[PDB]
Amino acid sequence: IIIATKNGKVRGMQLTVFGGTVTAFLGIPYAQPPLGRLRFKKPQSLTKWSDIWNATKYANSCCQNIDQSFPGFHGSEMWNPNTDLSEDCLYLNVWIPAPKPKNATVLIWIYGGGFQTGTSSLHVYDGKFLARVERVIVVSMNYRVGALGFLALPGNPEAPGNMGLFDQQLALQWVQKNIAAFGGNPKSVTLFGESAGAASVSLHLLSPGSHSLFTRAILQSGSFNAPWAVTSLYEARNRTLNLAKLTGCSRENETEIIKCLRNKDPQEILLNEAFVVPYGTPLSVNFGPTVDGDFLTDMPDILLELGQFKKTQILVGVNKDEGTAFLVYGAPGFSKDNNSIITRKEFQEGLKIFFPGVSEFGKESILFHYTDWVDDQRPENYREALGDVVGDYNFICPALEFTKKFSEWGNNAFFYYFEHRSSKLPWPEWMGVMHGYEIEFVFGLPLERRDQYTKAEEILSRSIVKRWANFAKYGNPQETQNQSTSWPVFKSTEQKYLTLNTESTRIMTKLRAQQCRFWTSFFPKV
Numbered sequence: 001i002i003i004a005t006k007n008g009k010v011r012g013m014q015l016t017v018f019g020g021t022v023t024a025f026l027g028i029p030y031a032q033p034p035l036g037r038l039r040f041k042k043p044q045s046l047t048k049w050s051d052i053w054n055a056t057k058y059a060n061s062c063c064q065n066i067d068q069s070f071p072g073f074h075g076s077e078m079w080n081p082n083t084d085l086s087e088d089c090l091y092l093n094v095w096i097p098a099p100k101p102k103n104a105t106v107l108i109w110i111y112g113g114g115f116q117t118g119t120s121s122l123h124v125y126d127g128k129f130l131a132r133v134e135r136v137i138v139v140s141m142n143y144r145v146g147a148l149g150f151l152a153l154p155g156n157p158e159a160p161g162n163m164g165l166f167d168q169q170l171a172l173q174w175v176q177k178n179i180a181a182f183g184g185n186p187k188s189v190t191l192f193g194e195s196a197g198a199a200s201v202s203l204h205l206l207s208p209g210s211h212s213l214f215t216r217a218i219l220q221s222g223s224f225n226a227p228w229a230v231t232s233l234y235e236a237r238n239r240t241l242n243l244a245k246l247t248g249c250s251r252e253n254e255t256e257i258i259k260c261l262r263n264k265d266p267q268e269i270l271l272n273e274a275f276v277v278p279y280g281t282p283l284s285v286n287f288g289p290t291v292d293g294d295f296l297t298d299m300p301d302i303l304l305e306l307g308q309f310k311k312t313q314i315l316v317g318v319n320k321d322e323g324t325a326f327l328v329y330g331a332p333g334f335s336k337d338n339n340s341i342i343t344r345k346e347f348q349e350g351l352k353i354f355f356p357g358v359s360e361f362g363k364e365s366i367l368f369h370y371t372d373w374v375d376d377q378r379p380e381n382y383r384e385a386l387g388d389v390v391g392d393y394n395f396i397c398p399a400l401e402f403t404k405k406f407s408e409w410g411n412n413a414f415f416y417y418f419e420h421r422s423s424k425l426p427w428p429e430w431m432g433v434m435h436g437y438e439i440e441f442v443f444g445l446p447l448e449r450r451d452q453y454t455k456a457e458e459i460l461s462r463s464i465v466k467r468w469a470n471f472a473k474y475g476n477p478q479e480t481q482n483q484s485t486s487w488p489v490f491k492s493t494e495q496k497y498l499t500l501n502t503e504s505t506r507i508m509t510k511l512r513a514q515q516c517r518f519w520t521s522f523f524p525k526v
């Protein structure tokens, strides 16, 4: 019940899972709270404590704006924070099997949310099932988001940028120094994350200072070469200054600006973040990772191109309908409460929404590539096209390209295509296999027979949980006992990937080949 860590004793709590027991340590601090003069700075190391820290409840989530578009709707509200917001939020969680393992592979989850939302306490991030079923230790951490976590005056230590990434890195360090006390193997640590979490993982592969803090990596629906994932130093400054103006904090001393933003209450900073950009999109990441020269020494697309990353195995994948969710946060004619049949006209307006600073030619080129129909009289033609445009540009093609480029340096890569729509999915059917709705399967929620999943979903989750754990433990995401499809390595020539569904698991080649040539070879010129 009580574990000695290098900063003090922490008391956990016991959980009944599937007629077994898991020990949960919820809300262990891993940094000095970034308050007062510490706001915007890199996380500071923790001063020891002499008591028994009671790590029995999730801690505060980090300050963040909340999605209020669909009040009372579980489909959107399941992602909103479920603990008090506070700047005091640098805490982490540990689930360890009972009885205490001896040298367990460690899984470290990094949540997504566009670098502006998210929290490790979400129901769908509960590591108790993975600990019970696979005897891995699961660790998750809160990290600062938004301007509080990514405001950047590059070079300036009062706000160097990438603080949220250093939050995560400091947590990986805590696991290196402390997880053997919990029965974990610090030499067998697999990072996994979804969306901005997955982009973060991919950046830890690139950041020299994280190379000794983990073994292997899993990237779900996200990678750093996604167009929303890195802010340029131009944008990052223009956005910092705009925030200064919106808060009456413009100064000439760049340091005095920060000093002024440090006296602002968190709500005022939060309220102004949306407007630092002239034209946002539903995919806007106004404050995110930048080339700071510390966590990131060069523009990441160059490091990836020239093999400057940790050499190891990766497991990468995407969902069938990553794009659809964003279409009801601003695309015209769209709604979660109807079939969202849209006209050609509405499709073109939608592109203006999703590609606001893109020229008329570029937008026409997106239209051209996605509107050569198999049947021009199918009315969902344009609704589906816009979802795929957003999905292919923002998630699927960057992840495939990351996997091609990373595998070209000799490392084993595994790619999956998740195409199961949860039987409990509260969004409408036209949105399909949405962004984020593989997470419950990865965490083994369908293993709980009491929670209204089909038996088919329990079998799919159980297989996915095995492949993930085998990947973490052995670098190979196979299910070796139940006559399962073998998951082949991804190679830049053949480009084989594994489809994950309840019906049949299949091996296919060259996912979204035509679409991604447009997005990765032509569209970056416009």
Ligand SMILES: *[C@@H]1O[C@H](CO[C@@H]2O[C@@H](C)[C@@H](O)[C@@H](O)[C@@H]2O)[C@@H](O[C@@H]2O[C@H](CO)[C@@H](O)[C@H](O)[C@H]2NC(C)=O)[C@H](O)[C@H]1NC(C)=O
Pocket: 238, 241, 242, 243, 245, 246, 275, 276, 277, 278
């Ligand atoms: C860089 O910043 C300027 C300033 O942004 C404006 O003011 C901020 C405080 C905030 O409220 C933003 O929403 C504002 O747009 C941007 O310049 C503006 O650009 C728009 C259209 O591009 C124009 O209509 C405004 O008049 C401009 N205002 C000023 C003061 O110049 C600029 O677009 C930003 N981005 C880039 C890439 O330079």
Ligand SMILES: *[C@@H]1O[C@H](CO[C@@H]2O[C@@H](C)[C@@H](O)[C@@H](O)[C@@H]2O)[C@@H](O[C@@H]2O[C@H](CO)[C@@H](O)[C@H](O)[C@H]2NC(C)=O)[C@H](O)[C@H]1NC(C)=O
Pocket: 331, 332, 333, 334, 335, 337, 338, 339, 340, 341
């Ligand atoms: C699907 O609904 C959208 C959204 O409209 C809102 O939500 C509906 C469920 C309903 O409660 C409406 O009263 C709401 O206004 C519709 O988009 C609207 O379309 C009308 C006419 O085309 C237009 O006046 C509005 O500006 C549109 N609102 C937008 C674009 O945000 C859409 O037409 C509906 N489509 C189908 C096929 O039913």
Ligand SMILES: *[C@@H]1O[C@H](CO[C@@H]2O[C@@H](C)[C@@H](O)[C@@H](O)[C@@H]2O)[C@@H](O)[C@H](O)[C@H]1NC(C)=O
Pocket: 011, 054, 056
């Ligand atoms: C930390 O917890 C100690 C033991 O708490 C015991 O177990 C928990 C689960 C509760 O059921 C509680 O009622 C029990 O007493 C406390 O003795 C101690 O005071 C706590 N420390 C702080 C700082 O709150």
Ligand SMILES: *[C@@H]1O[C@H](CO[C@@H]2O[C@@H](C)[C@@H](O)[C@@H](O)[C@@H]2O)[C@@H](O)[C@H](O)[C@H]1NC(C)=O
Pocket: 102, 103, 105, 185, 187, 188, 215, 473, 474
């Ligand atoms: C725990 O294991 C250490 C070696 O780790 C090995 O390599 C990593 C990459 C994983 O694949 C893991 O499964 C392997 O066991 C030992 O050096 C260490 O002494 C062990 N500690 C124990 C047994 O308490």
Ligand SMILES: [O-]/[N+](=C\c1ccc2cccc(O)c2n1)Cc1ccccc1
Pocket: 065, 066, 067, 068, 075, 076, 077, 079, 114, 116, 117, 282, 325, 326, 329, 434, 435, 436
């Ligand atoms: O983008 N926003 C919401 C969003 C995006 C993607 C999703 C994918 C799956 C399910 C969802 O509920 C999703 N919700 C709005 C919003 C943006 C930034 C801060 C606060 C709020």
Ligand SMILES: [O-]/[N+](=C\c1ccc2cccc(O)c2n1)Cc1ccccc1
Pocket: 067, 079, 112, 113, 114, 117, 118, 194, 195, 196, 228, 282, 283, 284, 285, 435, 436, 437
């Ligand atoms: O708000 N949520 C997601 C969100 C918001 C804004 C984004 C902007 C750019 C890129 C993104 O991936 C974004 N994702 C909720 C949510 C969290 C995790 C999984 C599913 C849904």
Ligand SMILES: *[C@@H]1O[C@H](CO)[C@@H](O)[C@H](O)[C@H]1NC(C)=O
Pocket: 253, 254, 255, 256
């Ligand atoms: C003002 O800027 C100078 C450098 O231009 C810096 O050394 C100084 O610390 C700033 N003022 C304060 C009060 O920190």
Ligand SMILES: *[C@@H]1O[C@H](CO)[C@@H](O)[C@H](O)[C@H]1NC(C)=O
Pocket: 462, 463, 466, 479, 481, 482
């Ligand atoms: C393998 O099949 C058995 C039933 O024959 C099932 O109980 C078990 O959960 C399966 N294991 C995996 C990893 O899917």
Ligand SMILES: [Cl-]
Pocket: 320
């Ligand atoms: Cl498809």
Ligand SMILES: [Cl-]
Pocket: 509, 510
């Ligand atoms: Cl082929």
Ligand SMILES: [Cl-]
Pocket: 517, 518, 522
């Ligand atoms: Cl082309």
